Design a protein around this nucleic acid. Structure first.
Lengths: 125, 359, 543, 99, 51, 108, 113, 125
RNA sequence: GGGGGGAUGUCCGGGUCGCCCUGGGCACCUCUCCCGGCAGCCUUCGCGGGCAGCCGUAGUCCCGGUUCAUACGUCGCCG
């Protein structure tokens, strides 16, 4: 799907972008794809990072493998740092609550664990 | 000045027994620095003295001696009262100093005052804009804040002021410590009310969108988790909770992946910025070792421009001489390099073009 | 660059001279025959003999009697001796501070050194042992003559300054003695741009002599004092020390973090080097016993007395005046109460080999603090004079509040908010009044719950702002604050105000041509003792 | 190592090493992150060796595998520290249920 | 006063919530074991030493 | 009602503490005070206070009279000179000015 | 072999007694041999070691003039080229070593050098 | 193995403790076992927490299920809080490095990911 | 780093079409003052101030491509 990727990103496609993002072959596609198109991908996936932060299982692995196969593209053309610089502000909004997002779980996950016991009293009852 | 304030309090007592609330309130405006115009900020308020604050709250609020009294609005319609609300003078320390005479024998006065005061404010203001202003302006305790959120939830569970008040009280109880919130909230709530507050923050989380996917927080943290610790095991004795902890786990693993990739994109942006610096200097012609291929150097290292300072014994610093600077550019040179001179160099104007072998 | 020099006159006439000169690069030039070289328009080619050992400045250079040894000493705490007959060096290697001065006896017998930590040692030759020993207060001094290594632009230029008032406690059961924070030396303490006191000394007030000395943190008074890059060491400073009520215990806290110039690679995103060192802060607390020979001995050490996700800088410490209980507040916000117990695991009591049981302090109580955040806090605490109740100023920006907590139960007895106009500096508790200093000064009774005294103090720089400090007397109900008169420099004045408990008029107004560094209350009788940056001390007494 | 961070010469101590020397020091580090009692000092040294010998990981793949076997314990060192706090919350309000 | 050259004292590392006690190391320092079997592997009735 | 004690002690000045004749005593220089100690007991035998007072003035130099012993020339930043005699205190109340801009050094 | 060299003068006064004036590192390896000359107004000492670079010093103006690092490389360039063949040549103890460059510079004007 | 557990912990066994710890049936054993013995278990597993912090996959699940089946034992006898209080200090030594233990991985795991690419260039080569 | 200019080379509407320009992209040399330090020289005790100031970058006749490091007094055995 690497040529599909290349096509989509040099005409600025979103439907073809979504066709590639719905689907291992991720590794295959990014080691297939090219360099400045990987920078274009990085920019608009940052847009995605902002506009929809739900389950990240696919696309954050995708930017991993993007920086794997063609992370060295944007040192060889470094002038577009604001491609990366604009990732570089989203990340710390993305960690604000982590000052207490584990302080979330432990008081709550025990209350979880209390019903696991109150279940365990009753299915034998 | 003590005799002066005693005479002023006696004159205000004379105004009270004459029931001259208009002139009394104008004296209050003169002290606080009727029209009663407002500065449009909770912050920029003139500093007022504790004796006038304590006399004001003494006159406004009341108590009932039956071994358990109750503040009442002696002045339910009062610009002085809404000024105390917006300036944040309605603290438990303030009202205990106000009613030092009759609260000396009653216990649990923090719980009593912090429960009763927002209920009093709510029956004053059904629009509860005064309540949200109190929430934003006053130093609040845990019982005060949980009764405030209780009033907001019986109000809801022209439609945005209550939500802003919810957010403000969420920030403040996120600030408050866990133990006091847990004990006072075990006191003041019922497990069904805790379930409604739980669903409120569930909606808050899922509207922030951490579960609804990509490719289609401390506040709520402290609030939702501390309140369920408050209710504890006495409440429930299901699959609601099962799906609930499932989406909790989705959000957790999402944030973990987020920190992993936080690190990598942070260092990538930093190295790309230093690479912009180095390739700017290389286009200038300072002949630094930077990468040439389209792949990342395994060492995320760049050749910085030479520090013009030279550290000497013992800690003294003299500037680097051009001799050693040339020694350093020489060691930075590689094994094979094409170093083309220009005729602009030969006349003395421009610089060369350097291309070293990729090391 | 010439630092100092000495000469031997070659003699019943004056036939020649030989001059050694020492310079802050660490070098000695000795010129052999200047009179014969400059008696002869034209002169011959003169060239001194070079002698480089010291890395930092050399401070004091002299000749040995018949002049066979070039004796010297400087910053690096080594008394160095050039052999001058062969190519060897002989050194008395590890002095307590930088060698400020060297002088010679009339005979070749006795050397006398002045050492940078206010000290003087007279030795006899090839005995090298303390034959006459005198030490002083060893305080941080604003130097009249600034420094001898402040001439050639070191990486950190050492600046005569005082960034914090001095930490000191008069000993109860022996008010003639006082413990006070010191480093190995004054110039070494100020080197690195941070206060470096991994050391405490006890000093007699009835006869103003430095009695004794003992370390608290890790020290290396034998290892090298300067790193290889040229940076002198910053040491764990003894931040907080307050003495027990009984005369038997002493609890201290030390802080030590890396410098920014050393972190340098822990930066990932928004991690500044300040963030890196504020993570890599290391804060010890140590409980100590004291023997009647003024012996300071360990009983416990706690590495983590205030911990949340990262370590919490611990804010204040206070002693119960009736019991062996130490309360402390940190950045956790909890106040923790520590009492000494007997080491006994499972009935087996741990006795010292002489027979006495091993005592060890422990967190007897924990009290969390309710917070009121309106839309970088600091803590301060003081017990009552009777005990049973503790007062704790929690200290965010202007919204800040004091909390009174019982001791028999961990329950809060009172909460008083809005008594600080900014961040808190400190607070004391007299017999009935709380005497707190923020940007404001507020003396405020609580049995009447009523402010008695209030002062808007003079706005100054931040150094002077911190250097304002306060202490009560508690024998006669009178308190006192020390405050400089408006970046701090040498020509600077401070004033001390004596206040009684009941009024607002000052009971004694007196300024000082230098800035007084610390004030302390005598425990036996009324009055205080105050020590000043031009490092001298004297006591105020009523009557 | 506490001495060499306290007298600030860890960077000097590690900047002049060779292939086999960083093999040994990395082996010690990878052995001894897992103790939290000196995990801080160990990860300081780990940061430094990352700063100092990440360049020739492709030149010497056996050290890249050592660089990997750094991670190959660390990817379960996240799980030890995480499940710590997962257990760390399991205790704290069971204490609250006492009262 | 020439400082006494003392080498680096090791850090007193903290103790876990069950130290190995003095008596524990004592009774484990009862080390040297001889395992002497009885006649015909007789279950050992009684052993004695007087005062 | 409150009263101040005399400022005693002080920081030892970098000006050379000088030996005594017969090597039995040591004249050490503080700020505002010059102290002679006896070496055998290592104990003070005389502390001589000196009023310094004009912001930053200090003892600039101090020297034994080379002509007659037990005499001390002490000099400040502004030119004020004392000729006190240790084992005693005669000369502390009578300085002499030198009419300098700023007295930087002196040698007797 | 501390790559270091010192100079020493007779003490004024006392006969037969000398002392070091100073020392310094000039070379980068040891100083295996040396020779001194003082003639036709030139007082020098030549020092040779193992870093191949002779270092010469003034005697009468020692500490008055800078030294001189003679070229560690021989006087003859010992480099040859057939420019039509673009062959470069260098010989030492028994071998002659030849490199061919096979390309120009304007073609490249990193990975291919 | 619940009676095995009960036996071992009321005679203070370590070999029988190790026989139970070498081995689902964990859930079975702890819902089999008793209350004050669960407190004894908690104390000496805290000892284990200190003395050997390697792979936690078994015993930290074990203390989970301990607090599941008989976590309410030590509220019904609360006087031995130092059983729990001594867990309550080990946990925060156990999290010190987590101030930067994710700052560990991300710079390192990319360097991992770089060899995954430099492998991917070569097995096709 | 900014604010600005004179000048180098560049594409897209382009212009009678040439000098280049406006509208977008711009990288550089230069000048300009406000950023950080560093010096000297007068001033006042100092606190401070003033004065004409340089540098924030690159390869030299040689050449600072330097100079610099922390004690003896006593060891061994085994408890």
């Amino acid at each position: 799907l690497g040529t599909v990727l290349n096509q989509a990103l040099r005409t600025d496609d979103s439907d073809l972008l979504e066709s590639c993002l719905q689907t291992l072959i991720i590794q295959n596609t990014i080691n297939r794809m090219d360099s400045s198109l990987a920078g274009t991908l990085l920019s608009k996936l940052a847009a995605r990072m902002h506009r929809r932060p739900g389950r990240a299982f696919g696309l954050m692995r995708w930017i991993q493998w993007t920086l794997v196969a063609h992370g060295g593209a944007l040192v060889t053309q470094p002038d577009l740092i604001n491609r990366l610089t604009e990732l570089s502000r989203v990340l710390e909004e993305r960690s604000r609550g982590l000052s207490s997002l584990l302080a979330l779980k432990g008081k709550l996950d025990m209350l979880d664990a209390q019903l696991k016991y109150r279940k365990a009293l009753k299915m034998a009852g | 000045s003590w005799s002066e304030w005693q005479n002023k309090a006696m004159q205000a007592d004379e105004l009270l027994q004459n029931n001259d609330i208009q002139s009394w309130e104008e004296l209050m405006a003169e002290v606080f620095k009727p029209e009663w115009e407002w500065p449009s900020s909770r912050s920029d308020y003139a500093r007022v003295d504790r004796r006038w604050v304590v006399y004001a709250i003494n006159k406004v609020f009341g108590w009932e001696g039956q071994n358990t009294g109750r503040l009442t609005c002696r002045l339910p319609e009062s610009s002085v009262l809404i000024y105390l609300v917006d300036a944040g003078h309605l603290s438990t320390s303030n009202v205990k100093s106000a009613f030092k005479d009759d609260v000396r024998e009653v216990d649990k006065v923090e719980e009593l005052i912090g429960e009763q005061l927002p209920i009093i404010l709510a029956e004053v203001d059904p629009t509860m804009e005064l309540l949200v202003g109190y929430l934003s302006g006053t130093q609040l305790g845990s019982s005060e804040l949980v009764s405030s959120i209780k009033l907001l939830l019986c109000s809801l569970g022209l439609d945005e002021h209550r939500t802003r008040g919810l957010g403000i009280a969420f920030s403040k109880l996120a600030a408050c410590p866990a133990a006091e919130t847990v004990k006072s909230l075990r006191r003041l709530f019922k497990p069904d009310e805790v379930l409604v507050l739980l669903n409120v923050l569930r909606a808050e989380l899922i509207k922030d969108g951490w579960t609804t996917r990509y490719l289609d927080i401390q506040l709520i943290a402290d609030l939702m988790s501390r309140c369920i610790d408050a209710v504890g095991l006495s409440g429930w004795m299901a699959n609601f909770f099962s799906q609930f902890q499932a989406e909790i786990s989705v959000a957790l693993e999402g944030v973990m992946e987020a920190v992993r990739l936080k690190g990598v994109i942070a260092e990538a942006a930093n190295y790309a910025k230093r690479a912009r610096r180095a390739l700017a200097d290389s286009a200038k012609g300072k002949a630094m070792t930077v990468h040439m291929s389209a792949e990342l150097p395994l060492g995320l290292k760049t050749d910085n421009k030479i520090s013009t300072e030279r550290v000497r014994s013992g800690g003294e610093i003299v500037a680097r001489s051009s001799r050693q600077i040339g020694h350093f550019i020489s060691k930075r040179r590689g094994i094979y390099s094409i170093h083309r001179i220009s005729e602009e160099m030969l006349l003395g104007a421009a610089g060369p073009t350097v291309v070293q072998e990729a090391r | 660059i010439i630092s100092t020099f000495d000469i031997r006159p070659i003699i019943a006439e004056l036939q020649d001279i030989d001059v050694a000169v020492g310079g802050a690069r660490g070098a000695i030039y000795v010129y052999s025959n200047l009179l014969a070289h400059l008696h002869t328009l034209r002169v011959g080619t003169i060239q001194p003999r070079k002698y480089h050992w010291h890395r930092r400045a050399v401070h004091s250079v002299k000749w040995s009697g018949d002049g066979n040894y070039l004796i010297s000493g400087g910053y690096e705490t080594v008394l160095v001796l050039w052999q001058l007959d062969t190519g060897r060096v002989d050194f008395l290697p590890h002095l307590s501070a930088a060698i400020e001065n060297i002088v010679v006896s009339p005979k070749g017998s006795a050397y006398a050194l002045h050492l940078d930590d206010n000290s003087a040692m007279v030795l006899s030759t090839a005995e090298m042992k303390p034959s006459m020993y005198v030490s002083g207060i060893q305080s941080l001094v604003l130097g009249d003559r600034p420094s001898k290594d402040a001439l050639v632009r070191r990486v950190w230029r050492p600046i005569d300054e005082i960034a914090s008032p001095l930490v000191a406690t008069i000993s109860p059961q022996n008010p003639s003695h006082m413990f006070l924070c010191v480093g190995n030396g004054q110039q070494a303490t100020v080197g690195g741009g941070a206060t470096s006191t991994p050391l405490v000394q006890v000093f007699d007030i009835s006869s103003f002599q430095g009695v004794a000395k003992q370390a608290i943190a890790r020290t290396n008074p034998t290892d090298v004092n300067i790193t290889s890059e040229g940076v002198p060491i910053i040491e764990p400073t003894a931040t907080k020390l307050a003495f027990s009520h009984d005369g038997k215990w002493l609890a201290s806290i030390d802080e030590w973090q890396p410098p920014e110039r050393d972190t340098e690679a822990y930066l990932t995103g928004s991690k500044t080097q300040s963030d890196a060192c504020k993570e890599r802060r290391e804060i010890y607390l140590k409980f100590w016993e004291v023997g009647a020979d003024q012996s300071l001995e360990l009983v416990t050490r706690i590495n983590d007395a205030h911990y949340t996700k990262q370590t919490e800088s611990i804010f204040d410490l206070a002693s119960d005046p009736t019991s062996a209980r130490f309360a402390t507040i940190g950045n956790d916000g909890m106040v923790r109460f520590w009492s000494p117990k007997l080491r006994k695991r499972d009935g087996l009591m741990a006795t010292r080999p002489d027979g006495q049981p091993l005592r060890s302090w422990s967190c007897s109580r924990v009290v969390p603090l309710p917070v009121h955040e309106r839309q970088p806090y600091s803590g301060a605490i003081t017990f009552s004079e009777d005990g049973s109740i503790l007062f704790a100023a929690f200290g965010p920006p202007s919204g800040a509040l004091v909390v009174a907590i019982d001791t028999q139960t961990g329950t809060v007895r009172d909460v008083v908010s809005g008594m600080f106009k900014g961040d808190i500096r400190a607070m004391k508790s007299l017999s009935s009044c709380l005497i707190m200093l923020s940007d404001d000064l507020v003396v405020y009774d609580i049995v009447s719950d009523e402010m008695l005294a209030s002062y808007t103090l003079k706005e100054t720089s931040e150094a002077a702002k911190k250097l304002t400090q306060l202490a009560v007397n508690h024998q006669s109900r009178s308190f006192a604050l020390a405050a400089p008169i408006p970046k701090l420099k040498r020509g600077t004045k401070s004033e001390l105000l004596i206040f009684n408990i009941e009024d607002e008029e000052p009971k004694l107004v007196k300024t000082f041509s230098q800035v007084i560094i610390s004030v302390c209350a005598v425990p036996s009788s009324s009055g205080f003792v105050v020590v000043d940056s031009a490092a001298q001390v004297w006591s105020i007494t009523e009557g | 190592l506490t001495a060499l961070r306290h007298r600030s010469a860890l960077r000097e101590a590690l900047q002049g090493r060779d292939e086999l020397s960083v093999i040994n020091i990395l082996r010690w580090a990878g052995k001894y992150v897992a103790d939290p009692r000196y995990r801080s000092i160990c990860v300081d040294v780990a940061f430094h060796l990352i700063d100092l010998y990440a360049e020739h990981v492709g030149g010497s793949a056996e050290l890249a595998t050592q660089f990997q076997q750094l991670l190959a314990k660390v990817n379960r060192e996240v799980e030890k520290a995480e499940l710590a706090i997962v257990t760390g919350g399991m205790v704290e309000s069971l204490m609250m249920s006492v009262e | 006063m020439a400082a006494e050259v003392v080498p680096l004292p090791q850090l007193k590392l903290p103790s876990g919530p069950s130290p190995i006690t003095a008596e524990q190391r004592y009774w484990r320092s009862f080390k040297k074991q001889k395992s002497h079997t009885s006649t015909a592997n007789w279950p050992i009735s009684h052993i004695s030493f007087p005062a | 009602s409150w009263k101040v004690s005399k400022p005693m002690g002080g920081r030892m000045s970098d000006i050379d503490p000088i030996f005594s004749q017969d090597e039995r005593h040591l004249i050490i220089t503080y700020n505002t005070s010059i102290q002679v100690y006896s070496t055998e007991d290592s104990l003070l035998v005389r502390r001589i206070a000196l009023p310094l007072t004009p912001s930053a003035t200090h003892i600039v130099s101090s020297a034994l009279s080379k002509s007659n012993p037990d005499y001390l020339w002490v000099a400040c930043s502004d030119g004020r000179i004392w000729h006190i005699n240790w084992t005693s205190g005669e000369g502390v109340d009578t300085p002499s000015t030198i009419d300098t801009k700023k007295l930087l050094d002196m040698a007797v | 072999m501390d790559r270091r060299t010192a100079v020493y003068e007779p003490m004024a006064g006392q006969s037969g007694r000398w002392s070091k004036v100073f020392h310094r590192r000039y070379h980068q390896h040891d100083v295996k041999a040396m020779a001194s000359f003082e003639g036709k107004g030139m007082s020098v000492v030549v020092s040779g070691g193992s870093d191949a670079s002779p270092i010469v010093l003034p005697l009468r103006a020692l500490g008055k003039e800078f030294h001189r690092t003679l070229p560690h490389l021989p006087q003859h360039p010992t480099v040859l080229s057939a420019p039509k063949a673009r062959y470069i040549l260098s010989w030492w103890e028994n071998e002659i070593r030849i490199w061919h460059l096979l390309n120009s510079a304007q073609q490249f004007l990193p990975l291919n050098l």
